[PDB]
Amino acid sequence: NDTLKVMTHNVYMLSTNLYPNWGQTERADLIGAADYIKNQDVVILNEVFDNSASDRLLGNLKKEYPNQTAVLGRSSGSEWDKTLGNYSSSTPEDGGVAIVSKWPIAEKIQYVFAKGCGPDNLSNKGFVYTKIKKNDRFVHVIGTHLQAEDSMCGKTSPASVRTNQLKEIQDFIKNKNIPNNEYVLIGGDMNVNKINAENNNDSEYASMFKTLNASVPSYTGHTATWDATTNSIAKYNFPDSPAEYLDYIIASKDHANPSYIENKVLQPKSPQWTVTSWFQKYTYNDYSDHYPVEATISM
Ligand SMILES: [Co+2]
Ligand SMILES: [Co+2]
Ligand SMILES: [Co+2]
């Protein structure tokens, strides 16, 4: 139909071995049945860390999105066409990134970043590359989740680490020799804040597009993707943190340049769910502490 619909959503599914009461299992069902995640061509998921809940979610999304990748950094067998980067089978946690699609996935590649804040690789953070055949056309979708802000980051800063991670993504894209007439999208929680930096050509926000050689999309919908002022989980965790705009889906300019590409932030609310933590009961109506970003790409 000459329109590509891609969504990315950091679903906040921390391991239940470390965070027992965040309703991971129930939200796997709520998200899986949610209306906001339907009718897409491809969906990028971030933070699908908990093994049981993530597999449950993927299972719930199987009907509409039967073509799925394994979760970044959880395994390294034939389920991946290639396992690149600093992959380690002994990390305490996986990368929490996965891509599902209603269309056949021709190639699945996982790549683990060389570095992050801290000298050790304890989560195989990185990206997932997919070559997808969407109605007689091959599109390329890379899903990722970049280094978060960390008080401790050695002699380097979170921004410098993210730039290096973005560099690995771009270097991989160039090396792949993808036809320049096919669409190449990079999406996920970049942990790069757009708020108050959209007009600053020197902001980390501006550098993101330069490093990935990507174009800037048209922005619609809500004004933030991690908002403690409207999101129930974010409010619980960080009541006074200003809203931030951290999730994106952008296109490589070294390939097919979309005549139009939009990133819309949605604010879907989930059915009410409750958890008990330290003898105190809490109720929420959000699927995650992050809001999903829905992209419309004209092809
Ligand atoms: Co998070
Ligand atoms: Co895991
Ligand atoms: Co976050």
Residue 196 half-sphere exposure toward CB, CA atoms < 13 A: 3
d(C-alpha 156, C-alpha 267), whole Å: 35
d(C-alpha 74, C-alpha 72), whole Å: 6
Specify whether the CB–CB gap between 12 and 290 falls below 8 A. Answer: yes
d(C-alpha 288, C-alpha 215), whole Å: 28
Q: Are strands 42-48 and 98-101 parallel, antiparallel or unpaired?
A: antiparallel
Between the CA of 52 and the centroid of ligand 3 the distance, in Å, is 21
Q: Are strands 218-221 and 261-265 parallel, antiparallel or unpaired?
A: parallel
Between the CA of 12 and the centroid of ligand 3 the distance, in Å, is 8
Q: Are strands 42-48 and 3-13 parallel, antiparallel or unpaired?
A: parallel
d(C-alpha 60, C-alpha 258), whole Å: 31
Output the CA angle 125-34-23, nearest 5 degrees.
60
d(C-alpha 299, C-alpha 297), whole Å: 6
Between the CA of 299 and the centroid of ligand 3 the distance, in Å, is 31
Residue 130: give its domain's CATH number: 3.60.10.10
Entry resolution (Å): 1.8
Closest CA to 102 of 129, 66, 143, 135: 66
Specify whether the CB–CB gap between 164 and 153 falls below 8 A. Answer: no
Q: Residue 47: nearest ligand to its CA? A: 1
Range of the domain at 124: 1-299
Q: Residues 6 or more apart from 65 whose CB is under 8 A from it? A: 40, 43, 100, 101, 102
Between the CA of 12 and the centroid of ligand 1 the distance, in Å, is 6
SS3 label, residue 82: strand
Closest CA to 177 of 207, 136, 140, 209: 140
Q: Are strands 3-13 and 293-298 parallel, antiparallel or unpaired?
A: antiparallel
Between the CA of 18 and the centroid of ligand 1 the distance, in Å, is 14
d(C-alpha 287, C-alpha 199), whole Å: 31
Between the CA of 47 and the centroid of ligand 1 the distance, in Å, is 7
Closest CA to 188 of 148, 156, 220: 148
Q: Residue 46: nearest ligand to its CA? A: 1
Specify whether the CB–CB gap between 165 and 222 falls below 8 A. Answer: no
Per the structure, the count of domains in the chain is 1
d(C-alpha 178, C-alpha 181), whole Å: 8
- Name the token pair of 250: 């952008």
Helix (H) / strand (E) containing 212: helix 204-212
Helices (H) and strands (E) in the chain, counts: 5, 15
281: Cα separation from own chain's centroid: 30
Specify whether the CB–CB gap between 113 and 165 falls below 8 A. Answer: yes
d(C-alpha 169, C-alpha 140), whole Å: 13
Between the CA of 144 and the centroid of ligand 2 the distance, in Å, is 16
Helix (H) / strand (E) containing 139: strand 138-145
Between the CA of 73 and the centroid of ligand 2 the distance, in Å, is 9
d(C-alpha 234, C-alpha 84), whole Å: 33
Closest CA to 207 of 243, 176, 242, 165: 165
* Phi and psi, residue 55, nearest 5°: -65, -35
Amino acid letter, residue 45: L
Q: Residue 123: nearest ligand to its CA? A: 2
SS3 label, residue 48: strand
Method of determination is X-ray
Closest CA to 191 of 108, 248, 241: 248
